[PDB]
């Protein structure tokens, strides 16, 4: 973040979508929720129909309980690409945000079926399974989540 402040010009910082994504993810890692949202909204302003990694935005907006923004993003992301696992994981995150979670588990498993090498869908499944009060399924899902990404 200090390098962004010093070694990155403002015009490049506030225009480059990759800078917006990286800065939002970084401020997520420092658990700075307010900072990340007003730059991810700018990123959506640059292009609404971009996927890359909305897992981060879905995770943020689940905490912020913004149902309408999540609904709009899920609708747009599915309408753009149906086969991308990120769209399905965002939809499942919204579903877990609402209330019901069995269909969220099924949607997450479908997203993992689209791309078996997506570790974040696996870890999101494991995190959700805690809400189901089930551990053995959760523990197996966690281990298979670690298998995909060694340093998670």
């Amino acid at each position: 973040i200090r390098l962004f402040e010093s070694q990155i010009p403002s015009h490049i910082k506030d225009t480059m979508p990759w800078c917006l994504v990286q800065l939002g993810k970084l401020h997520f890692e420092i658990i700075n929720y307010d900072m990340s949202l007003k730059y991810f909204n700018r990123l959506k302003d640059l292009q609404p129909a971009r996927v890359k990694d909305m897992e981060i935005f879905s995770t943020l907006l689940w905490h912020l309980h913004d149902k309408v923004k999540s609904s709009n993003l899920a609708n747009g992301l599915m309408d753009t690409m149906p086969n991308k696992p990120e769209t399905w994981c965002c939809i499942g995150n919204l579903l877990s945000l609402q209330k019901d979670h069995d269909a969220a588990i099924k949607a997450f498993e479908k997203a993992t079926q689209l791309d078996p090498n997506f570790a974040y869908a696996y870890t999101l499944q494991g995190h959700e399974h805690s809400s189901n009060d089930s551990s053995d399924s959760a523990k197996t899902c966690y281990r298979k989540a670690l298998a995909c990404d060694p340093q998670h």
Partner: peptide, 27 residues
Amino acid sequence: LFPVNHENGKDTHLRGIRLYVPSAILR
């Protein structure tokens, strides 16, 4: 058990049945 139905019926349906029992984070 359902030994007999109304008006001298033969078989029986069951529309619904349920059983009831009692008992910060990073996503």
